[PDB]
Write an enzyme that holds these catalytic residues in place. Sequence first.
Site, PDB file in Angstrom:
ATOM      1  N   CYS A 197       0.827  -1.214   0.000  1.00 44.80           N
ATOM      2  CA  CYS A 197       0.000   0.000   0.000  1.00 44.80           C
ATOM      3  C   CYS A 197       0.855   1.254   0.000  1.00 44.80           C
ATOM      4  O   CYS A 197       1.966   1.260   0.544  1.00 44.80           O
ATOM      5  CB  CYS A 197      -0.948   0.028   1.212  1.00 44.80           C
ATOM      6  SG  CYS A 197      -1.976  -1.449   1.376  1.00 44.80           S
ATOM      7  N   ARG A 225      -5.020   6.523  -1.393  1.00 50.13           N
ATOM      8  CA  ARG A 225      -4.068   5.425  -1.286  1.00 50.13           C
ATOM      9  C   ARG A 225      -4.262   4.408  -2.408  1.00 50.13           C
ATOM     10  O   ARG A 225      -5.350   4.293  -2.988  1.00 50.13           O
ATOM     11  CB  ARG A 225      -4.197   4.720   0.071  1.00 50.13           C
ATOM     12  CG  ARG A 225      -5.605   4.168   0.315  1.00 50.13           C
ATOM     13  CD  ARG A 225      -5.740   2.674  -0.006  1.00 50.13           C
ATOM     14  NE  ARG A 225      -4.845   1.850   0.805  1.00 50.13           N
ATOM     15  CZ  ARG A 225      -5.049   1.555   2.086  1.00 50.13           C
ATOM     16  NH1 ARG A 225      -6.107   2.022   2.748  1.00 50.13           N
ATOM     17  NH2 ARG A 225      -4.167   0.784   2.727  1.00 50.13           N
ATOM     18  N   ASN A 263      -0.979  -1.828   5.920  1.00 50.18           N
ATOM     19  CA  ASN A 263      -0.408  -3.008   6.570  1.00 50.18           C
ATOM     20  C   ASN A 263       0.952  -2.698   7.189  1.00 50.18           C
ATOM     21  O   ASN A 263       1.771  -1.977   6.614  1.00 50.18           O
ATOM     22  CB  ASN A 263      -0.271  -4.165   5.574  1.00 50.18           C
TER      23      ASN A 263
END
Lengths: 325, 325, 325, 325
Positions: C1, C15, C78
């Site tokens: 990400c 994002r 993450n």
Amino acid sequence: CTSVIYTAGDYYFGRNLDLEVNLGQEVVITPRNKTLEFREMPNLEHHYAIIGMSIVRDDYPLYFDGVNEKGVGMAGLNFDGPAHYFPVQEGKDNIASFELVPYILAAASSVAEAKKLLSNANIANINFSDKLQAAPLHWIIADKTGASVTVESTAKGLNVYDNPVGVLTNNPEFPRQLLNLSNYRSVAPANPANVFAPNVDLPVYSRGLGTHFLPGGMDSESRFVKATFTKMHAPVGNSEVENITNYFHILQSVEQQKGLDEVAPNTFEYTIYSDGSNLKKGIFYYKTYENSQINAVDMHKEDLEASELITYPVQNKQIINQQNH
Amino acid sequence: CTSVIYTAGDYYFGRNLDLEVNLGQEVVITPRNKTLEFREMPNLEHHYAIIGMSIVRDDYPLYFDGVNEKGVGMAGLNFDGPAHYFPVQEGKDNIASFELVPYILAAASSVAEAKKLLSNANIANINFSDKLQAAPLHWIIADKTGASVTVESTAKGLNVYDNPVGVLTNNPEFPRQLLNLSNYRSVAPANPANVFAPNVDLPVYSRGLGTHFLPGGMDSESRFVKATFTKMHAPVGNSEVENITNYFHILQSVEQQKGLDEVAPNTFEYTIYSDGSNLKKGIFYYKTYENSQINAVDMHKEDLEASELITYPVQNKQIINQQNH
Amino acid sequence: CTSVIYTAGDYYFGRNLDLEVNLGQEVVITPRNKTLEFREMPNLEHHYAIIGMSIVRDDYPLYFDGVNEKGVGMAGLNFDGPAHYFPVQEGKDNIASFELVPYILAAASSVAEAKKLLSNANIANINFSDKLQAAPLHWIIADKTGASVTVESTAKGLNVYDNPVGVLTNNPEFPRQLLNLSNYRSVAPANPANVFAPNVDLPVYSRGLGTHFLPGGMDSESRFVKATFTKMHAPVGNSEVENITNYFHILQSVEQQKGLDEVAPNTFEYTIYSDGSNLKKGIFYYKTYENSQINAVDMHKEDLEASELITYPVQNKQIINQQNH
Amino acid sequence: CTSVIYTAGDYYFGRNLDLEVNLGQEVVITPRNKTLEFREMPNLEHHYAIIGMSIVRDDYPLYFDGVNEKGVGMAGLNFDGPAHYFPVQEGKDNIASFELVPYILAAASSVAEAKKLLSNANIANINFSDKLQAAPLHWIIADKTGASVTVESTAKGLNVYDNPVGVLTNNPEFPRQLLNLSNYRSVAPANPANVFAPNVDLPVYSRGLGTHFLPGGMDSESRFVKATFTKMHAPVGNSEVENITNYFHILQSVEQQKGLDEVAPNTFEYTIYSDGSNLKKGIFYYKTYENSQINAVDMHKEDLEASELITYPVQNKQIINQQNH
């Protein structure tokens, strides 16, 4: 600076000292009965013998690095930025930055004992004198079992980290420096298989492509990676002479040549000396930038029951063998 | 292998020889009146004196590299793949690959004269003997004016390229090798200004970040870039001893340590020797992998009017100065 | 990400979500009067309206990322390894990892207010349910003034760092990630001057050599560097349509294409969606991997005084304009 | 510029066009009976139908790239420096640089036939007009069998190289560009085994570390490596829509975003358009920098027996799907 333990034979520990000026370094033997004074801890009237590279002020051995008779090695490396020293703290073993190498080498017979000696310690912001202010440092400790730790005093406090690679350079802090090695997992001495385009002929046009992405820069991260690779892939020598030869080749891989690391106009950080000692036998070896011949000072040829520092000047003139006549 | 001309003082030329085995190399002086036979050209009964690293078969000096009394240096470097030698050609000056270094050093007083000597030449596929087959090579020629050229015989024929950096390693062909340097234009000894994110504080956490992208690999392209940077940024020394000290530091930057360049199981290409000569004075200096002390053979201490090869064995035992007793 | 704030025009935040499977993501508007329950804090019966990408379980908006009507954006990325959540702590504002994005977007009107809301907070190890265990995350918060912070709960506790680059990816911890940018200070959009060998012609054989050392890998550090460079050098657009066009080009620079980031056999982490919102106007834009047409959901076309979640399915079929007939 | 053949399904060929200004590009279909004039060869009154991106001057299709009805694709890419065109030569098939794409796409039914058509050819220094001077180019030709070649006219003459990777960018010459791929043999989609320090725990702190050394720069060599990796590891799609989706993701990996490749003050080379065609079906797809929606022009929906160029304007306005209302 770069410090390594080379885990071959008797095992060998030392460092490159990288700086833009000489410091007055000499080889210093601290015998067992040289009293070592400490600002916030008891004096050590009797202790292990030490040999290493040092300056001497007020008959005190301000060691850059050394080894002791029990096979423990330690080096102080520049750590400008992260290094933080604290006020003297009640109930802590308070150690000045300039005392840490003399103290550990005098008192610890192993890395394990050095860990115990540091378990309640505080690196205190104590200057040696008004002329010699405390310099920002961190340290590596290693011993003849192959163990090593990295000692860092930062804003977080005092940390003693297991050092799985037996290497240390300068900034950044050790966990960051160690994590960066994971980026290089694919670098290897052997030629890599073609996993890039497996069904295409990609000719191996040069030997050594296993290390194509190995860093060769003068900066601290580059030298950490290259020195770790070079020591991890160093040979197991046959003799003591072969092992010390192999050892200096490890340090030479991350030598900083004059002209390559400019720190101010006309001013270059370069490897002023390289040293390494046999941890079992207490033999200290060194080269200077200006002299390629290895020099050896065997601590056990000295009177280790003496009470005064024993010193030797670094041989800094190039000694060329004139082979013909 | 890596060969450089270091353009300081009297100027200094030589090479690292990188290989996985020793070759029987010795230091060989070819005096002016040693007859040099050639397979397809007239014998040279009188010629310039040569000193260099060589093997000797049938009293012939099979030079790896050398310099002559007129300040010309030349080295043959492995070139496996691109190198191509041709059948003997009518009307061409046909030179065997094993003859090229002895011939140029015997006959040329400058790089300019070497260019004239090669202007109608053919590198012929002539073996020295059934035991010593022709090896794939290319060559660098340099002289005490600072000029240098790269000589390559490939499928295209014979090319003699101006060498603007005074460096040569192994594959690939020279124009490709030179073009690759353009990828490194931004690498520098000084700390780089922040052009990445100019309005963001990006702390300079280490010295030497100017060379963060400088290659440190064992492969031919990596060594070409790193050696060019290191020689281009080498200091101008004060004395002859300082200059030869600086010279070996240049070669040391691209030394191949044992264990890092694996060419077969348990088999590693490493720098078996490093040499460099004062081009004006004809003094040949060398180190071996196993001995860090520099050795000097002054060609003018010999009888350069002799007619037989004069040889010295390479000093390959580590000579350690035992400083204390 | 990869999450970025693009500081042009009205300013744009969002994002890339990189993963190896789809998650059931949909576009979710949380209106001002949708009650938001919290496990260890008071319910928010009235709050700011939110739009973002989310899954919904038990009528709760489990946001991956979103923006609110006051111009605050936030994304959870993450953070597997460093992330650590703590037991519920007396006297701390205890926030579950799955609640943090809904809570901040509901309650904070600026990054500054978000900092105050987090000043006594604890990210608690509270699972949403037995089916949805707490996932390891860290977060970026940004607002329409251009400010941003990085929120990390690790073994050290809860840290809220000023984010000077307005970018976040995955591991490692933010200070390490930010320090790594200093290694790239020399990378630039313009062609570099020749500081490598200044007196040698090193031809500029290609445009774009300023970014020759810019990383293009799929890993978290590579994407952080490349996304920071790309956003820091993005144009200032003219219109809102030009700005959202420019925004997706920033995210596209660090898109993970299928086949390039293998996480298990036949299993690849790829950019399942990219989103970005106008922070002033509350317009949410997104693309999926399978559809290149940008989709827009304007939060202010909805009833922001409603009390139930408003949802739209992601348009994941490639919509091709059939230009001829 | 970057051109690729994507060898999945029906196979797909096209290019990114990277430049700092628009050119007036439009989509042009050249039907079978459009007469194609040539300066030094016979006119082609009947030939294969062509679709591609082009400008039109004096009713001539000056193609940047295209495909023909027989599944042959071809693109002309900037080649400033190495490109050399020769005077018209007696006994050679003399082809102007601006004629080469129209000629090959009109006359060749395969890469093999294109090789025969070029076997006695000369790329002649013939300008289209005084207003449109000959630009320096090289070319890639590919076909629906997966074959491809690289066509370069340099100082050496005309070379047609087998292209084993089905990729082309800008400088340098193709053998050098192909050799550079060997430096990347170790880069892979999967996480690398720890061969750097095998007996040390080097944690895999991020996914994607297989591509840690994959280039992400804007320059021609960086884009060649990254595009080759991305196409070589692209998925095999299920449908035609999935395949064209996958195709544009390949080109997107080496898109040049505005602001990153500065060629003059305020002037940036960026990807003005990306196109790709189904080689079997003759469907031409394209995106512009300003519009993310894919556009399709099916050549077989046109009258391929016509005798005049058929043109469509590039859809360069961002078409945003307004999902809510």
